[PDB]
Protein backbone atom coordinates (compact mmCIF):
# COMPACT_ATOMS: atom_id res chain seq x y z
CA UNK A 1 0.00 0.00 0.00
CA UNK A 2 0.72 3.74 0.05
CA UNK A 3 4.19 4.74 1.34
CA UNK A 4 3.22 8.38 2.16
CA UNK A 5 1.19 9.26 5.24
CA UNK A 6 -0.86 12.09 3.72
CA UNK A 7 -1.18 12.02 -0.06
CA UNK A 8 -2.07 15.10 -2.12
CA UNK A 9 -1.94 13.99 -5.79
CA UNK A 10 -4.52 16.23 -7.55
CA UNK A 11 -4.40 19.54 -5.78
CA UNK A 12 -1.10 20.35 -4.14
CA UNK A 13 -1.44 21.22 -0.48
CA UNK A 14 -0.28 24.72 0.47
CA UNK A 15 2.71 25.28 2.70
CA UNK A 16 3.24 28.80 3.96
CA UNK A 17 6.87 29.57 4.21
CA UNK A 18 9.27 32.43 4.90
CA UNK A 19 12.43 33.20 2.94
CA UNK A 20 15.46 32.62 5.18
CA UNK A 21 13.43 30.61 7.72
CA UNK A 22 13.01 26.86 7.82
CA UNK A 23 10.55 25.07 5.56
CA UNK A 24 9.28 21.53 5.91
CA UNK A 25 7.89 19.36 3.15
CA UNK A 26 5.49 17.08 5.15
CA UNK A 27 5.85 14.03 2.95
CA UNK A 28 6.45 11.54 5.70
CA UNK A 29 6.45 7.82 4.92
CA UNK A 30 5.05 4.70 6.61
CA UNK A 31 8.47 3.18 7.18
CA UNK A 32 12.06 4.41 7.74
CA UNK A 33 13.64 2.67 4.79
CA UNK A 34 11.24 4.00 2.14
CA UNK A 35 13.29 6.01 -0.33
CA UNK A 36 11.81 9.39 -1.20
CA UNK A 37 12.89 11.91 -3.86
CA UNK A 38 12.20 15.63 -3.81
CA UNK A 39 11.48 17.38 -7.06
CA UNK A 40 10.90 21.04 -7.79
CA UNK A 41 8.75 21.96 -10.81
CA UNK A 42 9.58 22.71 -13.63
CA UNK A 43 12.56 20.45 -13.50
CA UNK A 44 14.84 20.07 -10.59
CA UNK A 45 15.62 17.52 -7.96
CA UNK A 46 16.44 18.60 -4.44
CA UNK A 47 19.37 16.56 -3.08
CA UNK A 48 19.45 16.13 0.69
CA UNK A 49 22.98 16.96 1.76
CA UNK A 50 22.48 16.51 5.48
CA UNK A 51 22.74 20.25 6.11
CA UNK A 52 20.51 22.77 4.36
CA UNK A 53 18.22 19.97 3.19
CA UNK A 54 17.57 17.04 5.48
CA UNK A 55 15.49 13.86 5.15
CA UNK A 56 13.46 12.47 8.07
CA UNK A 57 11.08 9.62 7.22
CA UNK A 58 8.96 10.84 10.13
CA UNK A 59 8.74 14.54 9.39
CA UNK A 60 9.55 14.90 5.71
CA UNK A 61 12.10 17.17 4.06
CA UNK A 62 13.54 19.89 6.20
CA UNK A 63 14.99 22.88 4.45
CA UNK A 64 16.74 25.35 6.65
CA UNK A 65 16.82 28.87 5.18
CA UNK A 66 14.37 28.38 2.33
CA UNK A 67 15.54 30.43 -0.69
CA UNK A 68 13.55 31.52 -3.73
CA UNK A 69 14.59 28.22 -5.31
CA UNK A 70 12.07 26.47 -3.06
CA UNK A 71 9.03 28.70 -3.43
CA UNK A 72 6.79 26.67 -5.73
CA UNK A 73 5.37 23.29 -6.53
CA UNK A 74 7.39 20.64 -4.76
CA UNK A 75 6.73 16.89 -5.18
CA UNK A 76 7.85 13.89 -3.17
CA UNK A 77 8.18 10.61 -4.98
CA UNK A 78 8.54 7.05 -3.65
CA UNK A 79 8.34 3.75 -5.55
CA UNK A 80 7.00 0.82 -3.53
CA UNK A 81 6.50 -2.54 -5.21
CA UNK A 82 7.18 -1.28 -8.75
CA UNK A 83 4.61 1.44 -8.20
CA UNK A 84 5.40 5.20 -8.23
CA UNK A 85 3.59 7.50 -5.80
CA UNK A 86 3.81 11.25 -5.35
CA UNK A 87 2.36 13.97 -3.14
CA UNK A 88 2.48 17.58 -4.20
CA UNK A 89 2.77 20.71 -2.10
CA UNK A 90 2.73 24.35 -3.15
CA UNK A 91 4.78 26.74 -1.04
CA UNK A 92 3.21 30.16 -0.66
CA UNK A 93 5.45 32.86 0.66
CA UNK A 94 3.63 35.34 2.76
CA UNK B 1 -14.40 20.49 -19.80
CA UNK B 2 -12.52 22.09 -16.88
CA UNK B 3 -8.72 22.37 -17.02
CA UNK B 4 -7.28 20.67 -13.93
CA UNK B 5 -5.22 22.80 -11.58
CA UNK B 6 -2.07 20.82 -12.31
CA UNK B 7 -2.32 21.44 -16.05
CA UNK B 8 -3.18 25.12 -15.64
CA UNK B 9 -0.25 25.48 -13.24
CA UNK B 10 2.44 23.72 -15.24
CA UNK B 11 1.27 25.25 -18.50
CA UNK B 12 1.21 28.81 -17.07
CA UNK B 13 4.51 28.62 -15.18
CA UNK B 14 7.45 30.80 -16.21
CA UNK B 15 9.09 29.34 -19.36
CA UNK B 16 10.20 30.41 -22.81
CA UNK B 17 7.04 30.81 -24.92
CA UNK B 18 6.68 31.94 -28.51
CA UNK B 19 5.89 35.63 -28.41
CA UNK B 20 5.04 37.89 -31.32
CA UNK B 21 7.33 40.89 -30.93
CA UNK B 22 6.93 44.21 -32.78
CA UNK B 23 10.07 44.97 -34.84
CA UNK B 24 9.95 48.61 -33.91
CA UNK B 25 10.50 47.87 -30.24
CA UNK B 26 13.52 45.70 -31.14
CA UNK B 27 14.92 48.29 -33.55
CA UNK B 28 13.55 51.67 -32.35
CA UNK B 29 16.27 53.22 -34.51
CA UNK B 30 15.12 52.52 -38.04
CA UNK B 31 11.97 54.70 -37.80
CA UNK B 32 12.64 55.76 -41.41
CA UNK B 33 11.67 52.26 -42.52
CA UNK B 34 8.36 50.43 -42.65
CA UNK B 35 8.74 46.71 -42.01
CA UNK B 36 6.87 43.74 -43.31
CA UNK B 37 5.97 42.03 -41.35
CA UNK B 38 5.87 44.64 -38.53
CA UNK B 39 6.18 41.98 -35.85
CA UNK B 40 8.03 38.65 -35.61
CA UNK B 41 7.69 35.31 -33.71
CA UNK B 42 10.35 35.00 -31.01
CA UNK B 43 10.94 32.67 -28.10
CA UNK B 44 10.64 34.83 -24.98
CA UNK B 45 10.34 34.25 -21.30
CA UNK B 46 6.74 34.45 -20.30
CA UNK B 47 4.36 33.12 -17.67
CA UNK B 48 4.01 33.66 -13.96
CA UNK B 49 6.26 33.11 -10.96
CA UNK B 50 3.27 33.21 -8.64
CA UNK B 51 5.15 35.38 -6.13
CA UNK B 52 5.23 39.17 -6.33
CA UNK B 53 8.86 39.09 -5.26
CA UNK B 54 9.85 36.98 -8.22
CA UNK B 55 9.97 37.81 -11.88
CA UNK B 56 10.37 35.46 -14.85
CA UNK B 57 13.67 36.32 -16.60
CA UNK B 58 16.00 34.70 -19.21
CA UNK B 59 18.97 32.75 -17.93
CA UNK B 60 20.19 31.72 -21.41
CA UNK B 61 19.92 33.57 -24.73
CA UNK B 62 20.71 33.30 -28.45
CA UNK B 63 20.00 35.18 -31.68
CA UNK B 64 17.94 34.40 -34.70
CA UNK B 65 18.17 36.10 -38.08
CA UNK B 66 15.18 36.52 -40.32
CA UNK B 67 14.36 37.99 -43.72
CA UNK B 68 12.44 41.21 -43.05
CA UNK B 69 11.19 43.54 -45.74
CA UNK B 70 11.94 47.18 -45.26
CA UNK B 71 10.13 49.75 -47.29
CA UNK B 72 11.79 53.16 -47.59
CA UNK B 73 9.24 56.05 -48.05
CA UNK B 74 8.64 56.45 -51.79
CA UNK B 75 12.02 54.97 -52.86
CA UNK B 76 11.76 51.23 -53.28
CA UNK B 77 11.80 48.49 -50.68
CA UNK B 78 14.30 45.72 -49.98
CA UNK B 79 14.49 42.46 -48.11
CA UNK B 80 16.85 43.03 -45.19
CA UNK B 81 18.19 40.35 -42.86
CA UNK B 82 17.44 41.16 -39.25
CA UNK B 83 18.81 39.60 -36.08
CA UNK B 84 16.50 39.26 -33.08
CA UNK B 85 16.90 38.23 -29.48
CA UNK B 86 15.49 34.91 -28.25
CA UNK B 87 15.19 33.41 -24.74
CA UNK B 88 16.38 29.77 -24.41
CA UNK B 89 15.88 29.36 -20.66
CA UNK B 90 13.73 31.24 -18.21
CA UNK B 91 13.87 31.33 -14.50
CA UNK B 92 11.90 32.85 -11.68
CA UNK B 93 14.15 35.29 -9.78
CA UNK B 94 13.91 38.11 -7.21
CA UNK B 95 12.97 41.45 -8.79
CA UNK C 1 20.91 30.32 -42.18
CA UNK C 2 18.00 32.73 -41.90
CA UNK C 3 14.17 32.51 -41.63
CA UNK C 4 12.59 32.92 -45.05
CA UNK C 5 10.39 35.97 -45.49
CA UNK C 6 7.38 33.84 -46.31
CA UNK C 7 7.74 31.82 -43.08
CA UNK C 8 8.38 34.91 -41.03
CA UNK C 9 5.27 36.35 -42.65
CA UNK C 10 2.76 33.52 -42.33
CA UNK C 11 3.92 32.78 -38.79
CA UNK C 12 3.68 36.42 -37.66
CA UNK C 13 0.37 37.23 -39.36
CA UNK C 14 -2.60 37.97 -37.09
CA UNK C 15 -4.07 34.72 -35.67
CA UNK C 16 -5.13 33.06 -32.39
CA UNK C 17 -1.99 32.32 -30.45
CA UNK C 18 -1.46 30.92 -26.99
CA UNK C 19 -0.99 33.81 -24.59
CA UNK C 20 -0.19 33.67 -20.86
CA UNK C 21 -2.67 36.02 -19.27
CA UNK C 22 -2.63 37.44 -15.75
CA UNK C 23 -5.75 36.46 -13.82
CA UNK C 24 -6.00 39.92 -12.27
CA UNK C 25 -6.29 41.97 -15.40
CA UNK C 26 -9.20 39.63 -16.30
CA UNK C 27 -10.83 39.84 -12.85
CA UNK C 28 -9.54 43.17 -11.50
CA UNK C 29 -12.20 42.89 -8.83
CA UNK C 30 -11.06 40.02 -6.60
CA UNK C 31 -7.98 41.88 -5.34
CA UNK C 32 -8.62 40.52 -1.80
CA UNK C 33 -7.52 37.12 -3.16
CA UNK C 34 -4.18 35.77 -4.27
CA UNK C 35 -4.37 33.31 -7.12
CA UNK C 36 -2.33 30.30 -8.01
CA UNK C 37 -1.22 30.29 -10.58
CA UNK C 38 -1.35 34.07 -10.94
CA UNK C 39 -1.63 33.76 -14.74
CA UNK C 40 -3.26 31.32 -17.16
CA UNK C 41 -2.80 30.07 -20.73
CA UNK C 42 -5.48 31.37 -23.12
CA UNK C 43 -5.81 31.48 -26.92
CA UNK C 44 -5.87 35.15 -27.82
CA UNK C 45 -5.53 37.15 -30.99
CA UNK C 46 -1.97 38.10 -31.60
CA UNK C 47 0.38 38.81 -34.47
CA UNK C 48 0.65 41.74 -36.80
CA UNK C 49 -1.63 43.18 -39.48
CA UNK C 50 1.36 44.93 -41.14
CA UNK C 51 -0.72 48.11 -41.70
CA UNK C 52 -1.02 50.79 -38.99
CA UNK C 53 -4.65 51.38 -40.01
CA UNK C 54 -5.53 47.81 -39.05
CA UNK C 55 -5.56 45.94 -35.74
CA UNK C 56 -5.79 42.19 -35.10
CA UNK C 57 -9.03 41.45 -33.25
CA UNK C 58 -11.33 38.51 -32.41
CA UNK C 59 -14.20 37.69 -34.77
CA UNK C 60 -15.22 34.60 -32.82
CA UNK C 61 -15.02 33.82 -29.11
CA UNK C 62 -15.81 31.23 -26.41
CA UNK C 63 -15.13 30.59 -22.71
CA UNK C 64 -12.86 28.13 -20.92
CA UNK C 65 -13.13 27.11 -17.27
CA UNK C 66 -10.02 26.42 -15.25
CA UNK C 67 -9.37 25.18 -11.75
CA UNK C 68 -7.78 28.14 -9.96
CA UNK C 69 -6.68 28.34 -6.37
CA UNK C 70 -7.51 31.42 -4.43
CA UNK C 71 -5.75 32.21 -1.22
CA UNK C 72 -7.69 34.58 0.98
CA UNK C 73 -4.97 35.75 3.43
CA UNK C 74 -5.09 34.32 6.94
CA UNK C 75 -7.83 32.02 5.79
CA UNK C 76 -8.82 29.18 3.51
CA UNK C 77 -7.26 28.20 0.22
CA UNK C 78 -9.82 26.52 -1.95
CA UNK C 79 -9.87 25.46 -5.52
CA UNK C 80 -12.38 27.57 -7.38
CA UNK C 81 -13.59 27.04 -10.94
CA UNK C 82 -12.93 30.08 -13.12
CA UNK C 83 -14.16 30.88 -16.63
CA UNK C 84 -11.90 32.68 -19.08
CA UNK C 85 -12.36 34.27 -22.48
CA UNK C 86 -10.84 32.66 -25.56
CA UNK C 87 -10.47 33.95 -29.15
CA UNK C 88 -11.27 31.27 -31.81
CA UNK C 89 -11.04 33.50 -34.92
CA UNK C 90 -8.93 36.62 -35.44
CA UNK C 91 -9.00 39.21 -38.15
CA UNK C 92 -7.24 42.35 -39.19
CA UNK C 93 -9.65 45.29 -39.00
CA UNK C 94 -9.62 49.10 -39.10
CA UNK C 95 -8.77 50.50 -35.69
CA UNK D 1 4.79 25.03 -69.69
CA UNK D 2 4.64 27.89 -67.18
CA UNK D 3 1.34 29.84 -67.10
CA UNK D 4 2.84 32.91 -65.47
CA UNK D 5 4.40 35.82 -67.27
CA UNK D 6 5.87 37.24 -64.02
CA UNK D 7 7.01 34.49 -61.58
CA UNK D 8 7.29 35.65 -57.90
CA UNK D 9 7.53 32.64 -55.58
CA UNK D 10 10.05 33.54 -52.92
CA UNK D 11 9.60 37.24 -52.22
CA UNK D 12 6.12 38.63 -52.87
CA UNK D 13 6.22 41.62 -55.17
CA UNK D 14 4.81 44.78 -53.61
CA UNK D 15 1.67 46.46 -54.96
CA UNK D 16 0.93 49.91 -53.55
CA UNK D 17 -2.81 50.33 -53.26
CA UNK D 18 -5.53 52.72 -52.10
CA UNK D 19 -8.51 51.62 -50.06
CA UNK D 20 -11.73 52.35 -51.95
CA UNK D 21 -9.88 52.76 -55.23
CA UNK D 22 -8.96 50.09 -57.73
CA UNK D 23 -6.42 47.34 -57.21
CA UNK D 24 -4.97 45.01 -59.79
CA UNK D 25 -3.21 41.75 -59.10
CA UNK D 26 -0.83 41.55 -62.15
CA UNK D 27 -0.79 37.77 -62.35
CA UNK D 28 -1.36 37.55 -66.08
CA UNK D 29 -1.17 34.22 -67.87
CA UNK D 30 0.21 32.98 -71.24
CA UNK D 31 -3.25 31.71 -72.35
CA UNK D 32 -6.82 32.99 -72.14
CA UNK D 33 -8.17 29.58 -71.05
CA UNK D 34 -5.78 29.01 -68.15
CA UNK D 35 -7.87 29.11 -64.93
CA UNK D 36 -6.35 31.14 -62.11
CA UNK D 37 -7.32 31.32 -58.46
CA UNK D 38 -6.75 34.19 -56.05
CA UNK D 39 -6.34 33.62 -52.36
CA UNK D 40 -5.63 35.88 -49.42
CA UNK D 41 -3.55 34.68 -46.51
CA UNK D 42 -4.43 32.64 -44.75
CA UNK D 43 -7.99 31.33 -45.00
CA UNK D 44 -9.39 33.14 -48.01
CA UNK D 45 -10.29 32.67 -51.61
CA UNK D 46 -11.25 35.68 -53.69
CA UNK D 47 -14.11 34.73 -56.10
CA UNK D 48 -14.48 36.82 -59.29
CA UNK D 49 -18.12 37.88 -59.49
CA UNK D 50 -17.80 39.80 -62.72
CA UNK D 51 -18.39 43.00 -60.73
CA UNK D 52 -16.22 43.98 -57.76
CA UNK D 53 -13.71 41.26 -58.69
CA UNK D 54 -12.97 40.62 -62.32
CA UNK D 55 -10.71 38.21 -64.07
CA UNK D 56 -8.76 39.18 -67.22
CA UNK D 57 -6.20 36.66 -68.47
CA UNK D 58 -4.34 39.68 -69.90
CA UNK D 59 -4.33 41.97 -66.93
CA UNK D 60 -4.92 39.74 -63.91
CA UNK D 61 -7.44 40.30 -61.15
CA UNK D 62 -9.18 43.65 -61.00
CA UNK D 63 -10.80 44.67 -57.79
CA UNK D 64 -12.81 47.86 -57.81
CA UNK D 65 -13.17 49.50 -54.41
CA UNK D 66 -10.51 47.45 -52.62
CA UNK D 67 -11.54 47.06 -48.97
CA UNK D 68 -9.31 46.18 -45.99
CA UNK D 69 -10.11 42.49 -46.72
CA UNK D 70 -7.65 42.82 -49.59
CA UNK D 71 -4.71 44.55 -47.98
CA UNK D 72 -2.26 41.67 -47.45
CA UNK D 73 -0.47 38.73 -49.03
CA UNK D 74 -2.44 37.67 -52.07
CA UNK D 75 -1.59 34.74 -54.26
CA UNK D 76 -2.60 33.56 -57.69
CA UNK D 77 -2.60 29.84 -58.31
CA UNK D 78 -2.90 27.87 -61.53
CA UNK D 79 -2.45 24.14 -62.26
CA UNK D 80 -0.88 23.37 -65.70
CA UNK D 81 -0.08 19.76 -66.57
CA UNK D 82 -0.66 18.38 -63.11
CA UNK D 83 1.57 21.12 -61.82
CA UNK D 84 0.46 23.94 -59.47
CA UNK D 85 2.11 27.36 -59.87
CA UNK D 86 1.61 30.51 -57.81
CA UNK D 87 2.79 34.16 -57.64
CA UNK D 88 2.50 36.12 -54.44
CA UNK D 89 1.80 39.81 -54.12
CA UNK D 90 1.97 41.98 -51.04
CA UNK D 91 -0.50 44.89 -50.99
CA UNK D 92 0.80 47.97 -49.17
CA UNK D 93 -1.67 50.80 -48.40
CA UNK D 94 0.54 53.83 -47.97
UniProtKB/Swiss-Prot annotation, chains A, D:
Changes after translation: N-glycosylated. Ubiquitinated after VEGFA-mediated autophosphorylation, leading to proteolytic degradation.
Tissue: Detected in normal lung, but also in placenta, liver, kidney, heart and brain tissues. Specifically expressed in most of the vascular endothelial cells, and also expressed in peripheral blood monocytes. Isoform 2 is strongly expressed in placenta. Isoform 3 is expressed in corneal epithelial cells (at protein level). Isoform 3 is expressed in vascular smooth muscle cells (VSMC).
Glycan attachment residues as annotated in the record: 33, 65
Residues annotated as domain Ig-like C2-type: 20-83
Induction and repression of expression: Up-regulated in coculture of VSMC/endothelial cell (EC) or by direct exposure to VEGF of VSMC monoculture. Up-regulated from the second trimester of pregnancy to the term and in the placenta of women with preeclampsia (PE). Up-regulated in monocytes exposed to bacterial lipopolysaccharide (LPS).
Family classification: Belongs to the protein kinase superfamily. Tyr protein kinase family. CSF-1/PDGF receptor subfamily.
Domain remark from Swiss-Prot or TrEMBL: The second and third Ig-like C2-type (immunoglobulin-like) domains are sufficient for VEGFA binding.
Subunit description: Interacts with VEGFA, VEGFB and PGF. Monomer in the absence of bound VEGFA, VEGFB or PGF. Homodimer in the presence of bound VEGFA, VEGFB and PGF. Can also form a heterodimer with KDR. Interacts (when tyrosine phosphorylated) with CBL, CRK, GRB2, NCK1, PIK3R1, PLCG, PSEN1 and PTPN11. Probably also interacts with PTPRB. Interacts with RACK1. Identified in a complex with CBL and CD2AP.
Disease: Can contribute to cancer cell survival, proliferation, migration, and invasion, and tumor angiogenesis and metastasis. May contribute to cancer pathogenesis by promoting inflammatory responses and recruitment of tumor-infiltrating macrophages. Abnormally high expression of soluble isoforms (isoform 2, isoform 3 or isoform 4) may be a cause of preeclampsia.
Functional summary from the UniProt entry: Tyrosine-protein kinase that acts as a cell-surface receptor for VEGFA, VEGFB and PGF, and plays an essential role in the development of embryonic vasculature, the regulation of angiogenesis, cell survival, cell migration, macrophage function, chemotaxis, and cancer cell invasion. Acts as a positive regulator of postnatal retinal hyaloid vessel regression. May play an essential role as a negative regulator of embryonic angiogenesis by inhibiting excessive proliferation of endothelial cells. Can promote endothelial cell proliferation, survival and angiogenesis in adulthood.
Protein name: Vascular endothelial growth factor receptor 1
Annotated source species: Homo sapiens (Human)
Lineage: Eukaryota, Metazoa, Chordata, Craniata, Vertebrata
Entire-sequence positions represented here: 132 to 225 of 1338
From Swiss-Prot, chains B, C:
Keywords: Angiogenesis, Cytoplasm, Developmental protein, Differentiation, Disulfide bond, Endoplasmic reticulum, Extracellular matrix, Glycoprotein, Golgi apparatus, Growth factor, Heparin-binding, Mitogen, Nucleus, Secreted
Cystine pairs: 14-56, 45-90, 49-92
This protein's record includes keyword Glycoprotein: yes
Expression across tissues: Higher expression in pituitary tumors than the pituitary gland.
One annotated Gene Ontology cellular component of this protein: secretory granule
GO BP annotations, alphabetical order: angiogenesis; apoptotic process; artery morphogenesis; basophil chemotaxis; bone trabecula formation; branching involved in blood vessel morphogenesis; camera-type eye morphogenesis; cardiac muscle cell development
Induction trigger: By hypoxia. Regulated by growth factors, cytokines, gonadotropins, nitric oxide, hypoglycemia and oncogenic mutations.
Linked pathology: Microvascular complications of diabetes 1: Pathological conditions that develop in numerous tissues and organs as a consequence of diabetes mellitus. They include diabetic retinopathy, diabetic nephropathy leading to end-stage renal disease, and diabetic neuropathy. Diabetic retinopathy remains the major cause of new-onset blindness among diabetic adults. It is characterized by vascular permeability and increased tissue ischemia and angiogenesis.
Protein's name in the database: Vascular endothelial growth factor A, long form
Residues of the whole record sequence present: 219 to 313 of 395
